[PDB]
Motif scaffolding. Sequence first.
Motif, PDB file in Angstrom:
ATOM      1  N   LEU A 281       0.771  -1.323  -0.002  1.00  0.00           N
ATOM      2  CA  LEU A 281      -0.023  -0.098  -0.301  1.00  0.00           C
ATOM      3  C   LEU A 281       0.490   1.100  -0.032  1.00  0.00           C
ATOM      4  N   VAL A 282       0.474   2.216  -0.705  1.00  0.00           N
ATOM      5  CA  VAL A 282       0.964   3.620  -0.849  1.00  0.00           C
ATOM      6  C   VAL A 282      -0.117   4.608  -1.049  1.00  0.00           C
ATOM      7  N   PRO A 283       0.328   5.736  -0.567  1.00  0.00           N
ATOM      8  CA  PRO A 283      -0.709   6.780  -0.625  1.00  0.00           C
ATOM      9  C   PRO A 283      -1.022   7.292  -2.078  1.00  0.00           C
ATOM     10  N   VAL A 284      -2.428   7.320  -2.607  1.00  0.00           N
ATOM     11  CA  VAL A 284      -2.677   7.918  -4.003  1.00  0.00           C
ATOM     12  C   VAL A 284      -1.980   9.056  -4.202  1.00  0.00           C
ATOM     13  N   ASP A 285      -1.853  10.079  -3.171  1.00  0.00           N
ATOM     14  CA  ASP A 285      -1.424  11.309  -3.421  1.00  0.00           C
ATOM     15  C   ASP A 285       0.313  11.395  -3.533  1.00  0.00           C
TER      16      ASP A 285
END
Length: 117
Positions: free
Chosen positions: A108-112
């Motif tokens: 998981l990584v931030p979309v932003d």
Amino acid sequence: NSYVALYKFLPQENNDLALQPGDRIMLVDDSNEDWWKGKIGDRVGFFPANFVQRVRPGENVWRCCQPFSGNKEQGYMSLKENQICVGVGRSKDADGFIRVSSGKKRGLVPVDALTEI
């Protein structure tokens, strides 16, 4: 046969293929474990096998636009600015994250933290 370059590669030999992060590459020869041959535009040559990652039909390529420190034990993958990631845009979750793969790692990584190449 479709791959994406993860890192810059400057040719060392005449038979080498220059890579820029985000370049789409068609695999030509993976018979050697260290040096693969591929094609970008009308250029053909060798590059390090570990400098590329598969991209499947319908997958997006992004680059990291700001660093992210992720807790790996909980399934989050840290990113460095300019790191190349592959995933599927509509798989983004309700909480502002998205799972992507980058090289041999995934999480998981931030979309932003991602932007289009």
